[PDB]
Ligand binder design. Structure first.
Ligand SMILES: *[C@@H]1O[C@H](CO)[C@@H](O[C@@H]2O[C@H](CO)[C@H](O)[C@H](O)[C@H]2O)[C@H](O)[C@H]1NC(C)=O
Length: 130
């Protein structure tokens, strides 16, 4: 499912992401936008390290979810990567919250660093009513 901007904003708010570890909803929206384009079925395989990034948050199969074909996987979210390809993003959110609880925080998302950090992101939630 490719969410609409404000639709996703309201969904993330309902799922407790606004202000989580101090991260605003606008920041979460910015990384979802640049990591997946708001598409829950987005999948990106890294041929070099043999791991895949799944879903709207592009979560890695080597550290957070288990897809069975990733060498040296850890599965810290205790989730089947397939759970991150569903239309209901509840599991994706619970896992995204786990990821930020790691020392690096939101710096785990490459796209946030390149396109959202130290930048005005208020545009992502304008007119959504969140
Ligand atoms: C993207 O890949 C990163 C590795 O290059 C990964 O970062 C590592 O995550 C580890 C989790 O146990 C630990 O925090 C390492 O210190 C860190 O380098 C990052 O989590 C991945 N991002 C996503 C969204 O999956």
């Amino acid at each position: 499912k490719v969410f609409e901007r404000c639709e996703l904003a309201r969904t993330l708010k309902r799922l407790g992401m606004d202000g989580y570890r101090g991260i605003s909803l606008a920041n979460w929206m910015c990384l979802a936008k640049w990591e997946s384009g708001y598409n829950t079925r987005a999948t990106n395989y890294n041929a070099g390290d043999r791991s895949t990034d799944y879903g709207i948050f592009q979560i890695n199969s080597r550290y957070w979810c288990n897809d069975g074909k990733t060498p040296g996987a850890v599965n810290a979210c205790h989730l089947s990567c397939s759970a991150l390809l569903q239309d209901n993003i509840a599991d994706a959110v619970a896992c995204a919250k786990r990821v930020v609880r790691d020392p690096q925080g939101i710096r785990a998302w490459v796209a946030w660093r390149n396109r959202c950090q130290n930048r005005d992101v208020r545009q992502y939630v304008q007119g959504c009513g969140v």
